[PDB]
RNA sequence: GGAUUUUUGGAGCAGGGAGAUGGAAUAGGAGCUUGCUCCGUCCACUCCACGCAUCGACCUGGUAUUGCAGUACCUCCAGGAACGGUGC
């Protein structure tokens, strides 16, 4: 599953009200970032589950990593990534500088590599089982090298990102 | 003949309007339309068994106004001439 | 202006109308009017205790019409 | 057409209040009776009057509380006022100015 | 004459009082001859009630005043 | 001859909305027919009133005489309603 | 839009944007015609541009 | 970067997920929360996350303030005049703060309208009988650290330290 | 399609006794024979009677000119 | 451009009865202070007719569902009824 701005939490207590659980989820998600939307239903199909869509994908990833298995109203909720994109996010959308990538999948196109590097800010260019990603900023390249060291993308293989030499 | 033309010429005057629910709003009349839309600035409204509240602007409809109160120094004889 | 209400699909159908003061009637509509006046043939009104009283063909004006719910699938 | 209907119908009863400068009473829907001289009228019964006296009756409305006290009547005076024709319920003309 | 009384308060948050005693605080976007107010993301106070885009009729309107700055 | 809230109510036909009457009755459902005189005819409607008597009906018709307010979704508040 | 001689007789908006886009830097006079073909294989592979081969040979 | 009127007038304000008027004041690093009179109590929620506020005080009278987000801050003390400035304060998120002792929760008992309180990720929550002391000192709070207060916890809070 | 004006004209031609209910008043209604009508639904009842359902009494008045703004429902009776 | 869906309004008013029941710190009159007696204004409890029946929101316990969605509202059982409105 690819990371997105919407994080879905399930296995929660369905005995509480919908508005109180939505306010509790908003107060829990406000510590990690700005919550743009909160989708919570109480029907027979969507019982005991909700989701929070944030502005930045990094805040949603930090909320999914930190609150993984956290006790919520007596029941430990399980957080995961969304399968599809949110409607509000789709409506609103429409060390060294060079980093060496190893053990990359050959079936991935340049758009998937751009979407993977889009967690960091704007880079100069991308080069394509080995790849070279060069960023315009040194701190952004360092954060991209520290974040992609063992990332969860195409789980049949393991991607490794290291700093380039001179 | 038409009271709307007489009510529209009463701008920049401190008057009062009592509604059907007992709320009295006293303020300076700044805008009057053909549908008696009273737009006042720096008004004070007192509802039924409530405390008076001062607002910077207010917009009351013509159908909700029950009675009006004009000062005694208003030239009603000169304003009646169309 | 003066457009008539869309009552062509509810013609000759058993519907329940609500009137002001908490009145409830049920009957088949027999026509339409631009002033929202409905003619209900063989209408039955609900009393306060719950008994239904047949009043026959009645005419309900649009000034007191609250809500009309069609009891038949149109 | 309009002037003849205003001078020959019920509005002539208003037109006798502004021409001869007589005092008439207006009972409103808020249980208030205002007696005064009609100065300006219209087709929608918009009555702009001067030197009006409005009388009514009010209850204490749970003022102090414990099950024995009566309401009372009251009255007030206004120099010049204007009332719309929607709240005017009853209009009575009587020779009270003499 | 100018009819700029309703156009000056366009795209602003206003609180309209109803006849039954309710208060709807919302962003006034458009109007008409029948004073039909469209309040996007409006709150109902009398307690707080989540309503959102509420299209209230002009027959149940009594008074309206400015609430705050536009978002 | 057609108002902008009337055009917004006519453009919102077919969405899950609600209409609260002057007596407190909230007819909720898909707006099938919306005329210029605020006549709301809905199919598979649901009655949730201020009395609280929640029920489900096949078809409902509420006129604009006793209609107090209308709660619509925010999908049409962006465009072309931006003036 | 830059003040170009081709846009002299033009007097519109959409047309001005279309002229600034179509009459922009077309395929002619590209980015120096990059063709690096680094020595990472010495017998195959030449699609590396001026920046790909540089990053491949630096590290 | 102190909180002034020009920073509050240029800050974004919109509707939150609970259909409340919230102003996003995050990313400002305000050392002290002040100059809040420019909002004129037109916001139902206050988003002051990721700041450097040391004391939750200095706020004017705001009857419309019902939610206060003070997450990711260094709040170690609470003002005693919180009830006189926010009578309708019901939501208080004080997660990841600098509260170490339970005695800072003693000015928080004056908020009678407070029902939702968050004191997670704090050294004061790691002390012995912190939840029982928070239930005994603040009986009006119904949800403490995303947990509903039961009758057994209220009986245990009323039994000890009576 | 049966028009309400045509039904009112048929009821005036048949001269049958009809009962008219008032708007926002369920305690008292009127009953009589409609002789004529107008565009404003103004009924002219001959030997009309006001029936109070709470007190179970009937007070006759005679020729009554009932306005159409107050009559909410009208039904036909056999009496 | 005051005659049924918007602007010349169908709005106004009052909360059942009883009991040697209880209180007006500073605010009733009369028998011309204080103490007592009488009479046209509330709240708390008790009795008859918990004013009645309805549904929604809500609290305790038990119990079922582990499900990827853009929402009037959402499992069921039992007790209690602080709230809302509908008809008498």
Short mmCIF file of C-alpha atoms in Angstrom, two decimals, chain H residues 8-87:
data_model
loop_
_atom_site.label_atom_id
_atom_site.label_comp_id
_atom_site.label_asym_id
_atom_site.label_seq_id
_atom_site.Cartn_x
_atom_site.Cartn_y
_atom_site.Cartn_z
CA UNK H 8 -3.69 37.35 13.85
CA UNK H 9 -5.21 39.42 11.03
CA UNK H 10 -2.98 37.71 8.43
CA UNK H 11 -3.54 34.19 9.79
CA UNK H 12 -5.82 31.77 7.97
CA UNK H 13 -9.28 31.08 9.41
CA UNK H 14 -11.72 28.48 8.09
CA UNK H 15 -14.11 25.72 9.16
CA UNK H 16 -12.70 22.67 10.94
CA UNK H 17 -13.85 19.05 10.73
CA UNK H 18 -16.41 19.62 13.51
CA UNK H 19 -18.03 22.54 11.57
CA UNK H 20 -16.46 25.12 13.90
CA UNK H 21 -14.66 28.36 13.05
CA UNK H 22 -10.97 27.61 13.63
CA UNK H 23 -7.97 29.86 12.99
CA UNK H 24 -4.72 28.11 12.06
CA UNK H 25 -1.94 29.83 14.03
CA UNK H 26 0.58 26.99 13.72
CA UNK H 27 4.14 27.58 12.57
CA UNK H 28 4.54 30.91 14.37
CA UNK H 29 6.73 29.97 17.40
CA UNK H 30 5.02 32.48 19.70
CA UNK H 31 6.73 32.55 23.13
CA UNK H 32 3.66 34.03 24.88
CA UNK H 33 -0.01 33.91 23.89
CA UNK H 34 -1.18 37.53 23.84
CA UNK H 35 -2.88 40.20 21.67
CA UNK H 36 -5.91 37.97 21.06
CA UNK H 37 -8.34 40.91 21.17
CA UNK H 38 -8.18 41.43 17.41
CA UNK H 39 -10.23 38.28 16.76
CA UNK H 40 -13.17 39.78 18.76
CA UNK H 41 -14.33 36.27 19.83
CA UNK H 42 -15.25 35.31 16.25
CA UNK H 43 -13.51 31.91 16.36
CA UNK H 44 -14.86 28.77 18.03
CA UNK H 45 -11.51 26.94 18.08
CA UNK H 46 -7.89 28.04 18.50
CA UNK H 47 -5.15 26.07 16.71
CA UNK H 48 -1.93 27.03 18.51
CA UNK H 49 -0.05 23.79 17.79
CA UNK H 50 3.76 23.68 17.37
CA UNK H 51 4.54 26.80 19.40
CA UNK H 52 6.84 27.83 22.26
CA UNK H 53 4.23 29.02 24.77
CA UNK H 54 5.38 28.51 28.37
CA UNK H 55 2.24 29.54 30.30
CA UNK H 56 -1.39 29.27 29.16
CA UNK H 57 -2.46 32.70 30.38
CA UNK H 58 -2.86 36.28 29.23
CA UNK H 59 -6.03 35.60 27.23
CA UNK H 60 -8.87 38.16 27.11
CA UNK H 61 -12.57 37.50 27.62
CA UNK H 62 -13.78 35.21 24.81
CA UNK H 63 -17.19 33.61 25.33
CA UNK H 64 -17.09 31.85 21.94
CA UNK H 65 -13.78 30.06 22.65
CA UNK H 66 -14.68 26.39 23.15
CA UNK H 67 -11.60 24.51 21.87
CA UNK H 68 -7.92 25.24 22.53
CA UNK H 69 -5.14 23.27 20.83
CA UNK H 70 -1.87 23.58 22.77
CA UNK H 71 -0.22 20.43 21.44
CA UNK H 72 3.56 20.22 20.81
CA UNK H 73 4.42 23.08 23.17
CA UNK H 74 6.33 23.78 26.40
CA UNK H 75 3.41 24.66 28.68
CA UNK H 76 4.41 24.04 32.29
CA UNK H 77 1.97 26.27 34.22
CA UNK H 78 -1.72 27.14 33.95
CA UNK H 79 -3.19 30.52 34.79
CA UNK H 80 -5.66 30.89 37.64
CA UNK H 81 -7.84 33.32 35.68
CA UNK H 82 -8.81 30.81 32.99
CA UNK H 83 -12.45 30.64 34.10
CA UNK H 84 -12.87 34.43 34.04
CA UNK H 85 -11.56 34.62 30.45
CA UNK H 86 -13.08 31.46 28.91
CA UNK H 87 -16.36 30.43 30.57
#
